[PDB]
Design a binder for this molecule. Structure first.
Ligand SMILES: [Ca+2]
Ligand SMILES: [Ca+2]
Length: 275
């Protein structure tokens, strides 16, 4: 039997599914540690690896890319879980190795691939404390080219009034995504600051793991794919909307949760966004 993880329902994805919108034909690049393309609850349409030691993007030694992929697009069937956008076209863009880390050159090469291959949405469930002008240039290029770029805000918690949002989420061109639990409470680890844009479910998120199994993780990396999947739902209903329009709807229609420094505009609501 299939289960619907709570976060899928919490962002109101099932309302879109009932309208007949499931992300069909929307191309979503998971820029991460690979995706296990053999998982029975995933359909990976293509991909590319930019990790020199791991030339197969369709294998994931970390688990993170596969987990994120399932939150975006786990198939609607008799098994496993259900993604936000279960008909979306998934692409495995491997820029992190089996340890879950990668060089900025590798990440940049993955983003360039996504641009060249006309992706609609990029999910970057990754981040770090240091900027790079090369990274900002390619992220901004992706956005200018029309791609929705969702990025994990980071898991650095709070530190008084200091922003703890990491890169590339800190850049204005990305949607920086923080984490709430099933009660819409901010997770203590969720990064904060002026750059934080929206929240999504990021605590005890059940998804696909390599080898055909499932399990729960915590992090803003689990929140991010809810937003990437939501963007794919919106584009499946509104195929002419630009990335800027999709982003403005996701942010503006969010359920306000409190102080924007901690919550941004609040919890995404894809039903309201896609109206
Ligand atoms: Ca399933
Ligand atoms: Ca941002």
């Amino acid at each position: 039997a299939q289960s619907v993880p709570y976060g899928i329902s919490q962002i109101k994805a099932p309302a879109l599914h009932s309208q007949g919108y499931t992300g069909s034909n929307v191309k979503v690049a998971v820029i991460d540690s690979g995706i296990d393309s053999s998982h029975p609850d995933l359909n990976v349409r293509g991909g590319a690896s930019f990790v020199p030691s791991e030339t197969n993007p369709y294998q994931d030694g970390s688990s993170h890319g596969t987990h994120v992929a399932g939150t975006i697009a786990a198939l609607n069937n008799s098994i496993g879980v259900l993604g936000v956008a279960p008909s979306a076209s998934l692409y495995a863009v491997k820029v992190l190795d089996s340890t879950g880390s990668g060089q900025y050159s590798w990440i940049i090469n993955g983003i360039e691939w996504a641009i060249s291959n006309n992706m609609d949405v990029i999910n970057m469930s990754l981040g770090g404390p240091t900027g790079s002008t090369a990274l900002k240039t390619v992220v901004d290029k992706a956005v200018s080219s029309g791609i929705v770029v969702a990025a994990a805000a980071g898991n650095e918690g709070s530190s008084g009034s200091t922003s703890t949002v990491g890169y590339p989420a800190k850049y204005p061109s990305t949607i920086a995504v923080g984490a709430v639990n099933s009660s819409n409470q901010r997770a203590s680890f969720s990064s904060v600051g002026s750059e934080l844009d929206v929240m999504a479910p990021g605590v005890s998120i059940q998804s696909t793991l390599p080898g055909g199994t499932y399990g729960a993780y915590n992090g803003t990396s689990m929140a991010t794919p809810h937003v990437a999947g939501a963007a794919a739902l919106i584009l499946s209903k509104h195929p002419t909307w630009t990335n800027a329009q999709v982003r403005d709807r996701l942010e503006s229609t969010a359920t306000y949760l409190g102080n924007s420094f901690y919550y941004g505009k609040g919890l995404i609501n894809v039903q309201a966004a896609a109206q």
